[PDB]
Design a protein around this ligand. Structure first.
Ligand SMILES: *[C@@H]1O[C@H](CO)[C@@H](O[C@@H]2O[C@H](CO)[C@@H](O[C@@H]3O[C@H](CO[C@H]4O[C@H](CO)[C@@H](O)[C@H](O)[C@@H]4O)[C@@H](O)[C@H](O[C@H]4O[C@H](CO)[C@@H](O)[C@H](O)[C@@H]4O)[C@@H]3O)[C@H](O)[C@H]2NC(C)=O)[C@H](O)[C@H]1NC(C)=O
Ligand SMILES: *[C@@H]1O[C@H](CO)[C@@H](O[C@@H]2O[C@H](CO)[C@@H](O[C@@H]3O[C@H](CO)[C@@H](O)[C@H](O)[C@@H]3O)[C@H](O)[C@H]2NC(C)=O)[C@H](O)[C@H]1NC(C)=O
Ligand SMILES: *[C@@H]1O[C@H](CO)[C@@H](O[C@@H]2O[C@H](CO)[C@@H](O)[C@H](O)[C@H]2NC(C)=O)[C@H](O)[C@H]1NC(C)=O
Ligand SMILES: *[C@@H]1O[C@H](CO)[C@@H](O[C@@H]2O[C@H](CO)[C@@H](O)[C@H](O)[C@H]2NC(C)=O)[C@H](O)[C@H]1NC(C)=O
Ligand SMILES: *[C@@H]1O[C@H](CO)[C@@H](O[C@@H]2O[C@H](CO)[C@@H](O)[C@H](O)[C@H]2NC(C)=O)[C@H](O)[C@H]1NC(C)=O
Ligand SMILES: *[C@@H]1O[C@H](CO)[C@@H](O[C@@H]2O[C@H](CO)[C@@H](O)[C@H](O)[C@H]2NC(C)=O)[C@H](O)[C@H]1NC(C)=O
Ligand SMILES: [Ca+2]
Ligand SMILES: [Ca+2]
Lengths: 639, 88, 640, 88
């Protein structure tokens, strides 16, 4: 029999004998490039991954076939033009090679106002209003969809996105790039339900689709526009010197976007290594396969890591006697640049089949972007698992352990809309984890035509060792979640997550006292959840691990923790991100805090009735999670 | 081609399209640098000869009070744009 | 060790030694007779039930306190008046004693049009339009809430409900009765969430609340109104000869309702006998305790059956060595005639704790209303069980087995809004069952002051043996749901259900092809569900019943069948009855069929966009249930 | 208790309440059987004597063009209503 100390050294020894640069630059050949969603080369790479899964002698390989509507450029060229002197002077700024998917096809003419990164606080700290004008924004900080939503909320008629040289130091300055403006995930025309032929594709439009045109432009076109506008950009923004603010008096900008929808067939490839004790429970390891350009950083590294992890685990189970108690699923997704279309539609299709079976998701997308920092975003249940993993995995260049900051958990940022783990965590209620070796600045070539293998190996010479470290982190994650009778999910991690929330809410106690309300029941629910976690820990400690009955009874209560945080009072179709902690909508705790923060201004932006309903529903969501983790229904106490 | 642009402008102006939106359509369809709508052919000759004097690399054509200037670089495009703004 | 054949006759021997009429007429003593929801005598009866549960020495006895808003009469009397000659002739019709809770407090004046029972077909087959007029209807067929909703949908300004002598043969022509008109369950001011102090009771109103006044009147007042009306009521209604249709031209009716809201504290009493093998899984046996009047037929019989079943099962566990594998929960609810307030609020409060633990609910309300027929309304998963209980339980009077009709399953009516098992089945996805020894006519004294023990013992002389038979049915249900390693839940039954649905849908093939759609994927979904049921049956057959882990895993696969039929695309707060088969809303299969009907009519009623989304979500709901029942996600082998 | 009903009718008529809604308020407050609004007091006395002749068990009181009839049974209530309809 093998224990953790042997599995770890076996995984490390197999990692030392594996080359990742070869597989990456093979995925960067002239077969497979470029691989847009639904393209022929994406299908070729899907078939290659499927046949490689077959070669690894996995327990079972299969495929899912979806038909989704994406958006592409039309025969008519998108245009950015400058008009002057009441339309008697026209100036072609750019015919961009890139575009923003799911943008509304229209033409709009008006003034161009700069809004920095397009965040809500950026629009708040602006003197020039953007109502009925086009907005120029630089990329970064938030997703394209968030920028377009924040602009459209203030009656902006158009959005232009560029890359400044200060945050994106690119020599070319005429490079085009690609993104999507859908404020959500999955096929925006099958919102909440899968994209299969069974649905017969009824008329359904996601509310996350924008109703204003958004277009990407190069830095050359951005500076060309800057040459026709006035006002110095604030030094707080840290942008180029050529930056300007608002167009001239008589100068207007005309933006013409003519993108068209296209129905395509995407393929999700899957392999599974069945468990030896509890095969019905499993971890899912996914990676995006498609990419607008070459996509070496985002999709190539992830797909190579997926292939090599599958190969190594199959070799361990077939030749080295590794016997996981629970199953392992390796998934190659498609259409990952229009949101998380493949993964989200797969979740929406088989949601009832993986309800309380799939218990962890590990995303491998964009895992190698630098060598300075090791960043991670995950559900609290995995925090400890991450911590114990950072204490015994060495840095690729410095040679030291990844665990250096003892307060890393207090600095973890939550998953964002562009990450494929976000629909796994906020929609399906499955704990998900994404990690990356990156830098303090964004990878400049993401979404561009220069996201190639040569530009990636030149920026990262030790790419093999960094990819090996990322694969080692992922492999230790997989082993810790499958090899032992105890699942390494730390429920107590949520206690602090609750303890902060109420405390934040307590900072507005006076408001709570002015509306005749009280926070005592939220404190009661938090304490009940804390005591339930403590009782569960003590029962785990007092139970014999060889008794399968009691162990499964406890693990079922462990695997229900993340599900009980999904809001049971909202529609999963019109509000799929149901998680009260990491979701999106008025049902989340951050939304409750946002609403309550508006009362003291006394302007009519605070909705008290909405706030009371939010308080009630969130309080009882926390209390129901606590009562479900407590145990049987007849062991709950009342006043 | 000069004749192609001339025939397109002719067909568009006879259809009822005003000069300004016709210039917008021209710059959308032919990927030209700058188009100027002038009041008479005097302004047309003035602006055309000015742009050809200060930017000899530009391809300038005049037709029906519309002066279309086509260049193939961005610096020369900015030069033509500034010259057209000054000469207007 | 004990087997089923021993437990059967031991339960029977305890049934023969149990007296039910004693406890019934004890619950009908002056210490408890008028137990309105939240009253003092309701609280005393709850205390008595709790002390009796403690005396039986159950595994645990506890209680839950809810604070809910009901509606009660005001100091000002509700009035029905007739005015004539432009208000110069005033005629007092009635100051009724009963009322309809959750009615809108208002005063309306207008014409009075008879609409039979107030069903949608009654309003459709009506010559006189009811828009802007008051509607008088008869009690029966549907609930009060359905009548008021169907009236308000056609712009009716008021509703009057009475009891005709043909349908309700009562001598007292001035008898009052009580009802409620909330189109839903639970506290209508905490819709979708429990009624606890933790929620702090935010301003939220259920959409099922009516916006027109509705009042109950006696037969004398109804005939007095008919004396001022014209037109003979159609012979298809089978009503009294004094029935009339429409008031005179110059005569109008004034209805004044002034009911007021009242916040009350309701108590739900619970006892639990813990299991010996799988104590975390359990069935729930509930019974309404409160009633507007004496409530001997509705709540008294149910509470007596609950007490006696608890006592007998506790005796079998403590004295006869009966070891249930799974737990048993006996529940006495409150506020059971204002909807299903107690049980619905309990479900909304502890839904996360009963997700995949509570696997069957057995309702005891109104189980003894007659001796002629034995009626049953339940989820198909219990059908087989019910059948297996009708083949060895004898009739209290005829002495023959209850299983006489071999095609009873094709004649089963679905649970209705007034039944307490409806929120258990349609909202929480728990298989539920309701049964009753009744007659072909409704019990006339339900909801009246004549629902006493005397009238019940006069109408049913052998009340003791009929109650014993009902308790035997419930006890056999519990025993076969608790004693063995198999739950005796027949999933294959749902196959038949699906086979019905598609069949009806085939009747509209010409329309489906006319919209450019196809039914092949729904055919494939039905076939895949059949295949999944067959695979689960073979897995049960090939697994050895002594292996508790594999058996519990298969039973976990079984306990997810009813849950996977809850629509995952609607809001459980604003559409709680999510069950696509037995719920309510545009997400159900009957709603899909009813909407598709209008395709042939070619008028504006058919919403093609809605139908396309309905067909898509319903098709994948069935396909998702089949894929989940098949097994693991990687073992789904079907042509996609 | 005829005179309290009379006081109520008088005080309600002085507050501006019309005779018809005053009759409705009277039948709502005192639970009387029938109220009749007459044009003059000769017709009032005539209708009151008619009701007294054909329903002698009824209590009939006349005040300010309002005739209030009170009975305690439903047969006599319907008889009073029909007599008021017939004699109106
Ligand atoms: C959870 O939520 C429920 C529903 O909102 C709350 O229940 C209400 O709680 C309030 C506050 O305790 C109750 O209001 C108080 O009720 C007392 C009950 O006394 C009864 O008996 C006396 C005779 O002895 C009667 O006169 C009285 O009408 C009652 O029938 C009253 O005694 C209280 O009056 C005193 O306090 C008030 C101010 O609170 C003063 O104005 C009075 O002069 C007097 O000093 C008061 O009326 C209310 O009745 C409860 N409703 C129900 C339906 O139970 C729960 O309190 C809440 N729980 C928690 C922990 O917050
Ligand atoms: C499931 O739905 C998808 C999408 O609706 C179907 O794919 C589509 O199938 C049709 C008919 O087979 C294709 O149309 C045909 O295209 C060819 C050109 O390749 C043309 O010559 C024909 O006249 C016809 O128009 C359509 O292209 C295709 N779309 C995609 C994106 O592949 C699929 O067939 C459906 N599957 C089943 C089993 O119904
Ligand atoms: C953006 O909003 C402002 C609102 O002030 C508009 O400015 C004008 O403001 C005056 C008030 O001093 C109003 O009387 C005018 O009606 C406003 N103009 C219009 C067109 O509504 C400003 O015009 C708005 N900009 C756009 C593009 O709609
Ligand atoms: C405050 O929030 C409530 C609830 O979100 C809003 O009430 C809804 O308003 C819309 C449009 O007015 C209606 O269609 C809904 O039916 C309302 N919901 C109800 C009644 O439950 C309310 O409008 C918000 N107020 C403001 C000023 O934004
Ligand atoms: C019920 O609805 C009908 C139809 O709308 C009403 O009858 C019409 O009333 C309008 C006045 O609003 C007249 O102009 C039409 O001539 C009427 N149509 C017919 C066929 O008579 C009717 O008044 C409504 N009833 C009530 C009580 O409001
Ligand atoms: C037909 O059904 C559709 C879908 O249920 C209805 O569309 C809704 O319309 C309201 C009103 O504008 C919107 O608030 C909803 O968001 C729409 N939902 C969808 C899914 O589109 C439509 O109104 C219905 N039409 C009729 C005549 O009943
Ligand atoms: Ca979607
Ligand atoms: Ca409720």
């Amino acid at each position: 029999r093998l224990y953790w100390d042997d599995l770890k050294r076996k995984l490390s020894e197999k990692l030392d004998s594996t080359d990742f640069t070869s597989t990456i630059k093979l995925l960067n050949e002239n077969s497979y490039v470029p691989r847009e969603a639904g393209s022929q080369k994406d299908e070729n790479l899907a078939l290659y991954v499927e046949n490689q899964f077959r070669e690894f002698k996995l327990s079972k390989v299969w495929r899912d076939q979806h038909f989704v509507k994406i958006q592409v450029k039309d025969s008519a060229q998108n245009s950015v033009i400058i008009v002057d002197k009441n339309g008697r002077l026209v100036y072609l700024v750019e015919n961009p090679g890139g575009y923003v998917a799911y943008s509304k096809a229209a033409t709009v003419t008006g003034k161009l106002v700069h809004a920095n990164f397009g965040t809500k606080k950026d629009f708040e700290d602006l003197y020039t209003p953007v109502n009925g004008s086009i907005v120029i924004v630089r990329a970064g900080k938030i997703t394209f969809a968030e920028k377009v939503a924040n602009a459209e909320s203030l009656n902006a008629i158009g959005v232009l996105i560029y890359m400044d040289q200060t945050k994106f130091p690119i020599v070319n300055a005429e490079l085009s790039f690609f993104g999507h403006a859908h404020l959500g995930t999955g096929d925006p025309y099958t919102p909440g339900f899968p994209s299969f032929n069974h649905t017969q594709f009824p008329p359904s439009r996601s509310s996350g689709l924008p109703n204003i045109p958004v277009q990407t432009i190069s830095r050359a076109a951005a500076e060309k526009l800057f040459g026709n506008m006035e006002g110095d950009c604030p030094s707080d923004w840290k942008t180029d010197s050529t930056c300007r603010m608002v167009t001239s008096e008589s100068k207007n900008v005309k933006l013409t976007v003519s993108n068209v929808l296209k129905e395509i067939k995407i393929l999700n490839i899957f392999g599974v290594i069945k468990g030896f004790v509890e095969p019905d429970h499993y971890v899912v390891v996914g990676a995006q396969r498609d990419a607008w350009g070459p996509g070496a950083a985002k999709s190539g590294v992830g797909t190579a890591l997926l292939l090599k992890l599958a190969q190594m685990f199959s070799d361990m189970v077939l030749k080295d006697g590794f016997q996981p108690s629970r199953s392992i699923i390796f998934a190659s997704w498609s259409a990952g640049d229009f949101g998380s279309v493949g993964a989200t539609e797969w979740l929406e299709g088989y949601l009832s089949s993986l309800h309380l079976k799939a218990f962890t998701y590990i995303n491998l997308d964009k895992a190698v972007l630098g060598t300075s920092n090791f960043k991670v975003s995950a559900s609290p249940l995995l925090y400890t698992l991450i911590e114990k993993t950072m204490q015994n995995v060495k840095h690729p260049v410095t040679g030291q352990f990844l665990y250096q900051d003892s307060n890393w958990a207090s600095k973890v940022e939550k998953l964002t809309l562009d990450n494929a783990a976000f629909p796994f965590l906020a929609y399906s209620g499955i704990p998900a984890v994404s990690f990356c070796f990156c830098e303090d600045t964004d990878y400049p070539y993401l979404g561009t035509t220069m996201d190639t293998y040569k530009e990636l190996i030149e920026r990262i010479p030790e790419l093999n060792k960094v990819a090996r470290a990322a694969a080692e982190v992922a492999g230790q994650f997989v082993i810790k979640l499958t090899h032992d009778v105890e699942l390494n999910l730390d429920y107590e991690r949520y206690n602090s997550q609750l303890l902060s929330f109420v405390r934040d809410l307590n900072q507005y106690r006076a408001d709570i006292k002015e509306m005749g309300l009280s926070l005592q029941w939220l404190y009661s629910a938090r304490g009940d959840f804390f005591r339930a976690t403590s009782r569960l820990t003590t029962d785990f400690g007092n139970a014999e691990k060889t008794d399968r009955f009691v162990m499964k009874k406890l693990n079922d209560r462990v695997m229900r923790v993340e599900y009980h945080f999904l809001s049971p009072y909202v529609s999963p179709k019109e509000s799929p991100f149901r998680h009260v902690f990491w979701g999106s909508g008025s049902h989340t705790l951050p939304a409750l805090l946002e609403n309550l923060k508006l009362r003291k201004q006394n302007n009519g932006a605070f909705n008290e009735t909405l706030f009371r309903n939010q308080l009630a529903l969130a309080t009882w969501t926390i209390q129901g999670a606590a009562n479900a983790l407590s145990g049987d229904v007849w062991d709950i106490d009342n006043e | 081609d000069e004749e192609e642009i001339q025939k397109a402008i002719e067909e568009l102006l006879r259809k009822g399209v005003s000069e300004e939106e016709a210039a917008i359509i021209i710059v959308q369809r032919f990927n030209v640098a700058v188009v100027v709508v002038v009041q008479d052919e005097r302004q047309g000759k003035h602006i055309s000869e000015y742009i050809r004097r200060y930017i000899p690399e530009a391809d300038v054509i005049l037709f029906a009070n519309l002066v279309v200037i086509k260049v193939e670089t961005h610096e020369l495009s900015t030069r033509v744009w500034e010259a057209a703004q000054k000469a207007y």
